[PDB]
Design a protein around this nucleic acid. Structure first.
Ligand SMILES: [Cl-]
Ligand SMILES: [Zn+2]
Ligand SMILES: [Zn+2]
Ligand SMILES: [Zn+2]
Length: 117
DNA sequence: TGCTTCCTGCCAATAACG
DNA sequence: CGTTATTGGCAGGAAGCA
């Protein structure tokens, strides 16, 4: 028992009973709620750190391996995450990768095992 | 104030369950 | 083994940090 529902204008919101954060879908509330309950743990496999979300652990573990998955297509430089890539493309190439063009390539993750696309 | 990490709608990949 | 439920990768804006 971790939420209540709030309905405004026919739109359904799921509210965390602990911190009152609002979610459009229940899956997100359940993913969020682990921060409170710590029902599941996500331990780094390279150090002692433990995370409340699987994706937080993954981003952290990529830091351990040093893999650079985000590649700028304008000059070929590669980056650890979206933020480094975006900062680069905006500052050096004066372009926005969230725009209407494909300015970067996200390589598959090869330095560790996560599900592929 | 420029890195560092967090956050959540969306949904493909994966697991659970008969 | 077909049907259903769950996980968690991803973008890219937000929040944290020193
Ligand atoms: Cl690499
Ligand atoms: Zn909460
Ligand atoms: Zn670690
Ligand atoms: Zn570049």
């Amino acid at each position: 028992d971790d939420h209540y529902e709030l309905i405004v204008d026919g739109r359904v919101y799921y509210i965390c009973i602990v911190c009152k954060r609002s979610y459009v879908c229940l899956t997100s509330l359940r993913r969020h709620f682990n921060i409170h309950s710590w029902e599941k743990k996500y331990p780094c496999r390279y150090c002692e750190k433990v995370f409340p979300l699987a994706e937080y652990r993954t981003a952290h573990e990529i830091h351990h391996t040093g893999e650079r998955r985000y590649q700028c297509l304008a000059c070929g430089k590669s980056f650890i995450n979206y933020q480094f890539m975006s900062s680069h493309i905006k500052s050096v190439h004066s372009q926005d990768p969230s725009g209407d063009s494909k300015l970067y390539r996200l390589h598959p993750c090869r330095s560790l095992q996560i599900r592929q696309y």
